[PDB]
């Protein structure tokens, strides 16, 4: 998983996923 | 009057009650911990929690309580980061797993 969420450490195959994941930490 | 923290993001849910504290760390219950990227989170560690779902796999990079892996956790009802499940990584450690949740993402305020 290349996306790596810099607040929490999440990790994800598709960006997408990486962008609703961010949004959220709006 | 409550004994639970809930998802401050849409409070639908409650995902642990104050007896389920403790502290890991003789740091006390809550401690602040940087990530690697200079974020601080104030985690609170309890045994138990409900109501929240995992995203990856475990990893032990940077883990604030060594021994132990995370894995991110988030609300199963808005899937707001909430904290991490802490698993230990050797058979001797106790428990073998926690939560850490982090401060700004429940309500009330801890
Ligand atoms: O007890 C705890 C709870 C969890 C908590 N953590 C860990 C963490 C790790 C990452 C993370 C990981 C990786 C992958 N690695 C690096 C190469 C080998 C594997 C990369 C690669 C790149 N980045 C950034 C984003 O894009 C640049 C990465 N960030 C982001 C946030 C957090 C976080 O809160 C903690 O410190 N301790
Ligand atoms: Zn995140
Ligand atoms: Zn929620």
Redesign the pocket.
Known sequence: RPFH??????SFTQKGNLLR??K??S | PSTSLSCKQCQETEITTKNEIFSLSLSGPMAAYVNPHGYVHETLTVYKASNLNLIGRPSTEHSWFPGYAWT?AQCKICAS?IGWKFTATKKDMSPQKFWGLTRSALLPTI
Request: aromatic share 0%.
């Open positions: 969420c810099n607040q929490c450490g999440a994941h961010i959220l930490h | 991110v980061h």
